Design a protein around this ligand. Structure first.
Ligand code: OGA
Ligand code: MG
Ligand code: NI
Ligand code: ZN
Length: 331
């Protein structure tokens, strides 16, 4: 069995190997990369996402989100307070202001310490989930707006033809902006490219041990657990590495830098934070190996998780017994 310790693997494809996306995902899985829940892919030196970023300040962040925490430093939830619209140029200046900027630090480890000590005491503002792309249309390799669609994958594997679309999303971050512990919708893969700026630190639980994280989360967030049998779908709960280690939860960590891709694998729980002003692009995707994970994915029916249009068909086809209850939670 490849990668039996479930370590995060780092890949360096050549320009030739970067042509065929599906083939390279399958290669990484042949080497056991999925067992970690997360992999890093460093593009060949010949590749570029686009020519320059010199012209992005006019993108609008229609609904910036202030991430307000409650709890203790290592075990907290966050809620998103909506803020007035602002441009990427305005948001960058805000991220760099004395109130929000990255503090002085020695290295990524010191910064990680400072994040887990102090996160709860601040409310950083995140531009998340913005439909769009920063890949040049002429970038042919690993262009996250040109991937094979999940609808097409389901049609190819299972024969069924469904409505829905699959487009990328932009994320503009600042120091302490936080992504809560989650798996993807329908336990899909994700791919995330850090276009520019400061790093992103990731934490991940191997898929084979995801239920260990769920059981700890039920213990740590007991009211939330009574409210919903899949409350991690709400994407609000944070648990620190120290707390994970105290409770014996297997996990790994890695820091993504500008120019790098990360892939999350089906049912790989992940969480993390941004180091400073940055911009990422991410999209969900599927492969044949996903289908069994999609059939078994948990679902939130309490009403909180509210998701895209395209998840309807995935539930309806892969999980027809759950469909009626889940759709009630959507409506
Ligand atoms: O970058 C972020 O804020 C969160 N991204 C992801 O959870 C992802 O790419 O799957
Ligand atoms: Mg612009
Ligand atoms: Ni994710
Ligand atoms: Zn719920």
């Amino acid at each position: 069995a490849q990668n039996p310790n479930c370590n995060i693997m780092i890949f360096h494809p050549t320009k030739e190997e970067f042509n065929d996306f599906d083939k390279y995902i399958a290669y990484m899985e042949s080497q056991g990369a999925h067992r970690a829940g997360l992999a890093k892919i460093i593009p060949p030196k010949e590749w570029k996402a686009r020519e320059t970023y010199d012209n992005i300040s006019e993108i609008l962040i229609a609904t910036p989100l202030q991430q307000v925490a409650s709890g203790r430093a290592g075990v907290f939830t966050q809620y998103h307070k909506k803020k007035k619209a602002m441009t990427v140029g305005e948001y960058r200046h805000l991220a760099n202001s004395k109130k929000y900027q990255t503090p002085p630090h020695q290295n990524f480890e010191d910064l990680e310490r400072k994040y887990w000590k102090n996160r709860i005491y601040n409310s950083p503002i995140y531009g998340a989930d913005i439909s769009g792309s920063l890949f040049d249309e002429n970038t042919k390799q690993w262009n996250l707006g040109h991937l094979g669609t999940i609808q097409d994958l389901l049609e190819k594997e299972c024969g069924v033809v469904i409505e829905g679309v699959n487009t990328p999303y932009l994320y503009f971050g600042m120091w302490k902006t936080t992504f809560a512990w989650h798996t993807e919708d329908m336990d899909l893969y994700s791919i995330n490219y850090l276009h520019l700026g400061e790093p992103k630190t990731w934490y991940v639980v191997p898929p084979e041990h995801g239920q260990r994280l769920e059981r700890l989360a039920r213990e740590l967030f007991p009211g939330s657990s009574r409210g919903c049998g899949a409350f991690l779908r709400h994407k609000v709960a944070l648990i620190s590495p120290t707390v994970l280690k105290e409770n014996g939860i297997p996990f790994n960590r890695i820091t993504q830098e500008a120019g790098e891709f990360m892939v999350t694998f089906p049912y790989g729980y992940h969480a993390g934070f941004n180091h400073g002003f940055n911009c990422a692009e991410a999209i969900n995707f599927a492969t044949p190996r996903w289908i069994d994970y999609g059939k078994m994915a948990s679902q939130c029916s309490c009403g909180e998780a509210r998701v895209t249009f395209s998840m309807d068909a995935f539930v309806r086809i892969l999980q027809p017994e759950r469909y009626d209850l889940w759709k009630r939670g959507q409506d």
